[PDB]
Amino acid sequence: MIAPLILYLDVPFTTFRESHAREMGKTYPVPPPATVYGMLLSLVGETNVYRHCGVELAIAMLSSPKKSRILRQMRRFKNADFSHPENVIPCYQEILSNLKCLIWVRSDEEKIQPSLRERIQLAFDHPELVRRFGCLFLGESDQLIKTIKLAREDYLEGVRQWAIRDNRGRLTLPYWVDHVGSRNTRFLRYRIEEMDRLSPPDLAWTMVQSPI
């Protein structure tokens, strides 16, 4: 079977807000599979979210990022008048600094050709043939990606912090996100086990599927 694609990520700042963290901007320690899937769709310029259902992603943390809080005068739709003072609320947002990680992309379970792995490989092969809009980012639109590149299993040849699907794990990362409410959001429990093991273990793979 074709070897899974490997991407090296380096984002100076990230915000993977929690699904239930609406009063305060609490962030996940590791990018959720849904956020990575959306980033890959943006990278290949695919607006439809159901197009690449079935792709499996594995995330390996190259280092533990530090969590910091920043104040922000975030806006909201509370009053009909745009200039009303009620539309601006001060709230904290937790960010992660100097995030480096390796992303494994495996597209065996996709039923629509070309697969996401092939699309990413073709986009990296001929960047001038990619038809997309906006700037690539991970998390919030202002959090641009510093380095995204094709890498091998030993890009830093160091020790890797894998995200393992453990039913007793701490983190509850979503692989599908409902941006309106929380009905269609689907969750999975993960843990961060320290293990170089260059290649992802079997439990480190998460398949992105529709909530149906």
């Binding site: 530090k66 969590k67 910091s68 809080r69 920043i70 104040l71 922000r72 005068q73 960010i95 600094s97 100097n98 202002d142 959090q143």
Partner: peptide
């Protein structure tokens, strides 16, 4: 001043992206 961690774990003062926008 709002601040957070950066390279080598040291604390640097930040300026929000919304400020520059």
């Amino acid at each position: 001043l709002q601040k957070g961690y950066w390279n080598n774990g040291k604390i640097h003062s930040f300026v929000g992206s919304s400020a520059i926008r």
